[PDB]
């Protein structure tokens, strides 16, 4: 397992390093790949580079990136999914989770506000207090 | 044989530079494709001696797989230690290392 949504802007415990970054989108590295210059580039930045300028060249070195010594950078990709980020749910929830579990933490995260278990009920809930919507606080028993 | 840097870098290596055959700075580091860094020297020849896997997590690998590490690479080499001779209290970039001690005073 162990991945993220790279779309999101996520909220590091520790500030995110420059080496976790990627070259050219800047972006947290989002399945690294490491060139023979020894950059490393987020997936899809890679292959957008390759539609560009035709000989994808290095944003750093200027050198030609020769995708026979392009490889993936699974070893920084363990290391970027073990960072830790403050909770979606920001003061809330003191979780500080992984970025490769954080997808499963919201799912069970107490405070992430779960829709009621109703016919319609338009009542903003918390997971934590859902049990106690269906108590005597929803208005279904 | 070849295994790694001995030289007791300025602040600690980290664990994530260091070589798991050798217990020490890679040197020449090379990466697996299950994403273990090893120095070139140590692996190939564990390939050699203990057969096709990679001795952290007996993942299947062969020689050929193997892709330089050129970010840790650099990395180390900018890492700053100390010149372990007698007397000198000297700390430069891992890269210099050799360019002090052929000058170095206490040798
Ligand atoms: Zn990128
Ligand atoms: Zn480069
Ligand atoms: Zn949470
Ligand atoms: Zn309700
Ligand atoms: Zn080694
Ligand atoms: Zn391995
Ligand atoms: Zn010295």
Known sequence: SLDFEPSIEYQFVERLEERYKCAFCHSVLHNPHQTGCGHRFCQHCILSLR????????????????????????????????????????????????????????????????????????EPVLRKDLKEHLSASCQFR | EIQGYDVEFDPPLESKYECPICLMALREAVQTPCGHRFCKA??????????????????????????????????????????????????????????????????
């Open chain 2, 42 to 107: 140590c692996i190939i020849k564990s390939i050699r001696d203990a057969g096709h896997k990679c001795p952290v997590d007996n993942e299947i690998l062969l020689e050929n797989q193997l892709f330089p590490d050129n970010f840790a690479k650099r990395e180390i080499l900018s890492l700053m230690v100390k010149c372990p001779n007698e007397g000198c209290l000297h700390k430069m970039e891992l890269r210099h290392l050799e360019d002090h001690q052929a000058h170095c005073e206490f040798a």
């Open chain 1, 51 to 122: 539609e560009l300028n035709t000989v994808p060249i290095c944003p750093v070195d200027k050198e030609v990136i020769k995708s026979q010594e392009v490889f993936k950078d699974n070893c920084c990709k363990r290391e970027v999914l073990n960072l830790y980020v403050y909770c979606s749910n920001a003061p809330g929830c003191n979780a500080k989770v992984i970025l490769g579990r954080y997808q499963d933490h919201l799912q069970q995260c107490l405070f992430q506000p779960v829709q009621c278990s109703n016919e319609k009920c338009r």
